[PDB]
C-alpha cells in the first residue's frame, strides 16, 4: 500500500 514517486508533491501513484 505504498506511494511511488515520480516527482515532488502529487506526482505519485499508490500500488
Amino acid at each position: 500500500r505504498k506511494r511511488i514517486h515520480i516527482g515532488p508533491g502529487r506526482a505519485f501513484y499508490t500500488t
Epitope: 511511488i4 515520480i6 516527482g7 515532488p8 502529487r10 506526482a11
Partner: antibody, heavy 123, light 109 residues
Framework: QVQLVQSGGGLVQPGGSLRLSCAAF????????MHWVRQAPGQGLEYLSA????????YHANSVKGRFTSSRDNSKNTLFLQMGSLRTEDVAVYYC????????????????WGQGTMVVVSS | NSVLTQSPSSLSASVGDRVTITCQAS??????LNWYQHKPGKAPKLLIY???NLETGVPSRFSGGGSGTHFSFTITSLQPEDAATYFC??????????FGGGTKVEIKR
C-alpha cells in the same frame, strides 16, 4: 519562450507501432517531470503517462500500461512515447506537458503543453 | 476512480458579463484542481492552479474557488479573446488524475 513541439503523428495499421517525440524549447528540460495526455474526438482529455526528470521512473495508466512506453533523452531535450499494439480507441490528438510543483501548497499542475500531434489507427 | 462532472457543457455570454463554470468531484480531492484554457489548434494553457491561485501572466479577469468535492471557475468581465474551451483537471495523484468534459464558451455579439 517556454515551448513544446510534437512530432511523429500519422497513420498506423491496427496492431502496428509508432514513436512520438516531444521537443522542448526555451527551458531546462532535464529538471522537469513530463506527462503524456490524449484526447479522442468528441471526448474529454485522458491522462496517459508520467516520467521522472532522470527518466528511469515512469507511470502508465491502465488503458495503455503494457502497450505504450514513455522514455526521454535529456541530452537531446526530447520526450518520447513508444506506441505498440494500437486500437481504434487510440485515435486521438496526443499531448505532452511539463509538470510544475508548487512547494508552498505541496501541489502540482501541467504549466506547459504542446500543440498536440494526431494519431490515426486504420487499415 | 475519480470522475469529474463539468457544467454547463456550453455557454454563451456578452463582453463585460460575469460567468461561472462548475466542476464536481466524486471524491474529496482537497484543493488539487486546476483550470485550463484551450483554443482550437493551440496548446492548452494553465490559468488557475490548486482551486484559487493565479499562474503568472494570467489576468485578474480569471478566478477560482472551492475545495473538497465542489469547485468553481469565474471569468469576470468577458473579452472577445476568451472564446475558448475551458476544462478542469483533478491532480490528487497520478493514479486518479482525470479531466472534466470541458465548457465551450461563446462570446455573444
Amino acid at each position: 519562450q517556454v515551448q513544446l513541439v510534437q512530432s511523429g503523428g500519422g497513420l498506423v495499421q491496427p496492431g502496428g507501432s509508432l514513436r512520438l517525440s516531444c521537443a522542448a524549447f526555451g527551458f531546462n528540460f532535464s529538471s522537469y517531470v513530463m506527462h503524456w495526455v490524449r484526447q479522442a474526438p468528441g471526448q474529454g482529455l485522458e491522462y496517459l503517462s508520467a516520467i521522472s526528470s532522470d527518466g528511469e521512473t515512469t507511470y502508465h495508466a491502465n488503458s495503455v500500461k503494457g502497450r505504450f512506453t514513455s522514455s526521454r533523452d535529456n541530452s537531446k531535450n526530447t520526450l518520447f512515447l513508444q506506441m505498440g499494439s494500437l486500437r481504434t480507441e487510440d485515435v486521438a490528438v496526443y499531448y505532452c506537458a511539463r509538470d510544475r510543483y508548487y512547494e508552498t501548497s505541496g501541489s502540482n499542475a501541467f504549466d506547459v503543453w504542446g500543440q498536440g500531434t494526431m494519431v490515426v489507427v486504420s487499415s | 476512480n475519480s470522475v469529474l462532472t463539468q457544467s454547463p457543457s456550453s455557454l454563451s455570454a456578452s463582453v463585460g458579463d460575469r460567468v461561472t463554470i462548475t466542476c464536481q468531484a466524486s471524491q474529496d480531492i482537497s484543493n488539487y484542481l486546476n483550470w485550463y484554457q484551450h483554443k482550437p489548434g493551440k496548446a492548452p494553457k494553465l490559468l488557475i492552479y490548486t482551486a484559487s491561485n493565479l499562474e503568472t501572466g494570467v489576468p485578474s479577469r480569471f478566478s477560482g474557488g472551492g475545495s473538497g468535492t465542489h469547485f468553481s471557475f469565474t471569468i469576470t468581465s468577458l473579452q472577445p479573446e476568451d472564446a475558448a474551451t475551458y476544462f478542469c483537471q483533478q491532480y490528487d495523484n497520478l493514479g486518479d488524475l482525470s479531466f472534466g468534459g470541458g465548457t465551450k464558451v461563446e462570446i455573444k455579439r
